[PDB]
């Protein structure tokens with residue numbers, strides 16, 4: 001894995017349908033390739049609220065024409081749900097879909113190909129943990145992420161107030177028994193460590209990669225990166241500055257025209273789909289949300305669309 005990054009971005013690939021729901025943004029994607037298809041889960045976003053959509057397609061060229069399955073038709077149901085993460089929890093032979101609903105929540109499903117199968121929400125905690133209540137400021141408890149190793153499962157989350165939290169439980173007890181979170185990382189400037197963590201095992205190494213979204217000096221979204229030999233840290237900077245970013249307008253080329261100056265809430269294409277959240281160190285690809293740089297107004301009505309970064313300084317195939 002290199003210590004600097006360069007990317008080539010697609011145009012916008014996935015946006016809202018023109019249906020009566022009048023969704024304004026498609027957001028916060030999670031993605032796996034399974035049995036010959038891409039499976040994308042995303043937030044639907046508008047002034048009126050958030051829920052979740054499932055999108056599947058064979059080929060990236062067909063992403064834009066793929067049908068949506070609105071997950072409020074499954075037991076997962078209506079109400080607020082946002083920012084999904086999908087993975088296969090192999091010990092239970094069950095797919096998990098992790099998201100936020102005011103708490104840290106999850107659904108299960110034996111078959112990712114069955115969007116109607118996602119369960120009504122359960123929560124990982126009985127309420128907001130004390131350490132998060134104490135330090136949230138006037139932020140929001142968001143962006144829930146699970147990663148496991150051979151003995152522990154870890155649940156990360158953000159507060160939009162410069163704290164990354166981490167709880168753990170045993171692999172056998174998952175999804176139950178998550179302990180009181182510790183602050184895994186923090187910054188006194190909430191903009192430097194804002195939300196939307198990703199945490200991955202780097203194949204071929206005994207290291208992990210942390211990505212985290214930030215709001216830069218220009219007001220634009222970007223990603224910082226760190227690595228560690230443990231999911232529990234300590235984290236050391238990889239590409240974590242505006243002049244050496246994980247992903248930002250200044251290291252993102254476009255084959256076409258530059259349609260976004262924001263590189264926001266995304267996910268890397270994985271090398272496998274299980275609860276260890278593995279990535280290859282080669283040919284990194286980042287599925288992310290961007291938007292017209294002239295967009296303004298209420299945050300929830302912003303016209304987010306999904307695009308794909310392909311690494312151009314790749315170390316390997």
Ligand SMILES: [Ca+2]
Nearest residue numbers: 028029083084
């Ligand atoms: Ca996410």
